[model samples]
Target: SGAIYVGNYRVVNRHLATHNDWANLVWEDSSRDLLVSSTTAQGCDTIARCDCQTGVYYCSSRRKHYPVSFSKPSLIFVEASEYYPARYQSHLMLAVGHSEPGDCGGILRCQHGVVGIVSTGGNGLVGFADVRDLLWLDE
Candidate 1:
C-alpha cells in the first residue's frame, strides 16, 4: 500500500474513480504498484490505483476544479493481442505506454528515431519507449 499527502490531507491506499484529461499515473518497477491523480472535464480532481493483479481500475474525483487536466496514466505489462491492430498480428514485440496518449505517444523503442512529443491530455505528442529499450534522455 502507498499514500500521498495533498495540502493537509493524507490519503491512503486509495484508487481514482474518474478519468479525465491531465491525469498522471506512476508505477514502481518490479512491484507493479500504481499511483494515479487526475482532473476531469467537469472540473474535478481524483487519485487512485490499479489492482495488484491488473484486473481492476478505480478512481475518485473532486468537482471543485471542474475541467481539470488528467494526463493519461502509464502502465506496464506484457503486450497482448488485444493491444494491437490487425495489421501487426505477427509482431512479437510488446506494446507499452499510456493508452490515452496514442500508440506512438510514450512508446519506448530500442532504436531511436524520434517517436513523438509529450502531450497534455490527448495532444498526442509525447514520445515514449519501453524501459528495456531506452538508451538515454536528451536532457
Candidate 2:
C-alpha cells in the first residue's frame, strides 16, 4: 500500500520565475539569501544559501512532516565545483527515486535526506539557473 500523494501544480505565466509552495513561499531575501518554507513531512524543509564571500554551501531547516507510509519530498542542493563546456562553476546534480510503474516505491537520494517510495522514475538534476538553460545546450 503506497502512501505518497504526488500532487500536481500548474505553472502559470505570472509565477513562472517565482517560487512558492503550499505552506510558505521561497524567494530571494534582500541580502541575496534564499528562504524556504517549513516542510509538512517528518523533517524540516532545507534551505541552501550561497555565500558570495565564502563560496560554500549552508543548509538549514524549519519544520518536519508527518511520518506516514508516504514518501517525503525534498529539494536538494548540489555544489557546482566543476566547470563544463560553456558553463561556469555552477553544476549541480539532482537525484530522485524511480517513481515509474515498475520503479514505484523506490527511493530518492537528495542532499538533505532520503525520500522513499517514489512514484516516478529516474532522477531530477538542476543547475544554478533554470532547467531550460541546460536544455539549451542541445540546441
Candidate 3:
C-alpha cells in the first residue's frame, strides 16, 4: 500500500509482489547526489544513509540523520524455496543504510557508498548489497 522511487528505480510495498521485503523506503536528494548533509530528526518515516569512510550507517528524516546499519545472512522465502531475491533488480547497488529497532520496512541513505538492496525483516536472512545506486522492479 506504499511506494517510493529512489533515483529512477521504483520501490513498492512487498517487492516482487510476493517477497516480504522492505515495505517502506524513503529518502531525499542532496548536495551528494542523494544524501542529506544536515540530518532531519523528525518525519523519519524510514530513510537512512551510510558513510564509506566511517563504515557506519545513519538515519534521515524523522530519525534525524541517525546511524543505521544491519547484517543479514542471505535471503528468505515468503512462499517457497527460492534464491531469495530483492524482488527488485539494480545493477547500481545504491548507497543505502538500515536500522534494527527502528523503522518498519526501513531504507536509509549513507554518507558514502553504492546503491544496494536493503531487505526488510526482523529475523532470518536479511540481505543488503551496500555496494551502487538505483533499484528496478522486475529488472
Q: Tell me the lDDT of candidate 2.
A: 0.23
lDDT of each: 0.23, 0.23, 0.31
Which is superior by TM-score, 1 or 3?
Answer: 3
Q: Which stretches of candidate 2 lie over 4 Å from their true place?
A: 1-23, 26-35, 40-91, 94-107, 110-112, 115-139
Superposition error at 112 for model 3 (Å): 3.1
Residue 124, model 2, lDDT: 35
What local lDDT does model 2 show for residue 42? Answer: 47
- What range of 10 consecutive residues in model 3 has the weakest lDDT sum? 30-39
lDDT of 1 by residue, 1-139 (tens): 2233332222221122124211343322222211224322232212222111111111111111111112233442322233232222111122222234222222111122222122212232222221212122210
List model 3 lDDT by residue over 17-66, tens digit each: 32223232333321111221121222222233333322332332145443
lDDT of 1 at 93: 23
After the best TM-score superposition of candidate 1, give how far the Cα of residue 85 lies from its true spot, in angstroms: 30
Cα RMSD for candidates in order: 17.0, 15.5, 11.4
TM-score between candidate 1 and the true structure:
0.15
